[PDB]
From a paper:
AlkB homologue 5 (ALKBH5) is a ferrous iron and 2-oxoglutarate dependent oxygenase that demethylates RNA N6-methyladenosine (m6A), a post-transcriptional RNA modification with an emerging set of regulatory roles. We report three crystal structures of ALKBH5 in complex with an m6A-ssRNA 8-mer substrate and supporting biochemical analyses. Strikingly, the single-stranded RNA substrate binds to the active site of ALKBH5 in a 5′-3′ orientation that is opposite to single-stranded or double-stranded DNA substrates observed for other AlkB subfamily members, including single-stranded DNA bound to FTO. The results support a mechanism involving formation of an m6A hemiaminal intermediate, followed by efficient ALKBH5 catalyzed demethylation, enabled by a proton shuttle network involving Lys132 and Tyr139.
Using higher ligand concentrations in the sample mixture and the crystallization drops, we subsequently determined structures of (i) ALKBH574–292 in complex with the same m6A-containing 8-mer ssRNA and the 2OG cosubstrate in the P32 crystal form to 2.1 Å resolution, and (ii) a structure of ALKBH574–292 in complex with NOG and the m6A-containing 8-mer ssRNA in the P21 crystal form to 2.5 Å resolution. The structure of the ALKBH574–292–NOG–RNA complex in space group P21 has five copies of the ALKBH574–292–NOG–ssRNA complex in the asymmetric unit, two of which manifest electron density for all eight nucleotides of the ssRNA substrate, likely in part due to stabilization by crystal packing contacts with neighboring molecules. Four (G−2G−1(m6A)0C+1) of the eight nucleotides are visible in the other three molecules in the asymmetric unit, in a similar manner for all the ssRNA substrate molecules in both the P32 crystal form structures. Aside from the four extra nucleotides observed in the P21 structure, the active site ssRNA binding modes in all the chains in the asymmetric units of the three structures are similar. At the ALKBH5 active site in the structures reported here, a catalytically inert Mn ion (substituting for catalytically active Fe(II)) is coordinated by the highly conserved metal binding triad His204, Asp206, and His266, a water molecule, and either 2OG, NOG, or a sulfate ion. In the structure of the ALKBH574–292–NOG–RNA complex, the NOG adopts a highly similar binding mode to 2OG, although with slight variations in the conformation of its C-5 carboxylate group. The crystallographically observed 2OG and NOG binding modes in ALKBH5 when complexed with Mn and an m6A substrate are of the ‘off-line’ mode. However, our crystallographic data may represent a snapshot of the complex in the catalytic process, where rearrangement of the 2OG C-1 carboxylate could occur.
Residue numbers in the entry: 79 to 292
The structure:
RNA sequence: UGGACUGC
């Protein structure tokens, strides 16, 4: 109710990438999945889950079960130079478009993470670690349409999700920017019922200078 | 039937 308007103030969203531009980027995402299957990336570049894969370029992070002590501020960057560099196509096809459209300043993005969701995949509600990433947070969706939900309570065995404070549809080719309240004081997630087809999203962030590393 | 928030 009153919190939903607080979330809306920190959301920017627009259809930035055309259908032709999405197809070219989605072919590059298929190249990343192929190299990961062939084991051509560094070990910490690929993070696999039952219905979701994360591909860390520039800077990666540990999360969830990878944390020995589960708590705020426990996420860590990987050692310097551990994960693979940002691919050239990410700079030219995605980051350059965002910089030229003034979504984020030039030289802001130093971390590009690709999330590849199989049908029915999800990601549990979370705040992007405040001790790791600066604000704002940019994400570009591909392959299919879906939604981003805020303030959801996850329960498991089996996975049940509560009603979101706000549901934001993320259409294919759209850019989502999170700032202020929507990025710091409320979690965001993806519910399994929002992934009907394969969906990939490229999240582009800047890590803090004092971000702790492994 | 696929798990970042108990930051309750
Ligand atoms: O698909 C999305 O936008 C959700 N992804 C995240 O919140 C994340 O990887 O940190
Ligand atoms: Mn996130």
């Amino acid at each position: 109710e009153e919190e939903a308007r607080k979330v809306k103030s920190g959301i920017r969203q627009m259809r930035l990438f055309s259908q032709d531009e999405c197809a070219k980027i989605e072919a590059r995402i298929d190249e990343v999945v192929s190299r990961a299957e062939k084991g051509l990336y560094n070990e910490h570049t690929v993070d696999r889950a039952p219905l979701r894969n994360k591909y860390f370029f520039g800077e990666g992070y540990t999360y969830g079960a990878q944390l020995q002590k589960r708590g705020p501020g426990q996420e860590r960057l990987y050692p310097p130079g551990d994960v693979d560099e940002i691919p050239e196509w990410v700079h030219q096809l995605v980051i350059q478009k965002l910089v030229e459209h003034r979504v984020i300043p030039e030289g802001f993005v130093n971390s590009a993470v690709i999330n590849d969701y199989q049908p029915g995949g999800c990601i549990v509600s979370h705040v992007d670690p405040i001790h790791i990433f600066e604000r704002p947070i940019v994400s570009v969706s591909f392959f299919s349409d879906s939604a981003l939900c805020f303030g959801c309570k996850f329960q498991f065995k089996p996975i049940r999700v509560s009603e979101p404070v706000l549901s934001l549809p993320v259409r294919r080719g759209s850019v989502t920017v999170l700032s202020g309240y929507a990025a710091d004081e409320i979690t965001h997630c993806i519910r399994p019922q929002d992934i009907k087809e394969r969906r990939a999203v490229i999240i582009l962030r800047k890590t803090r200078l004092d971000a702790p590393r492994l």
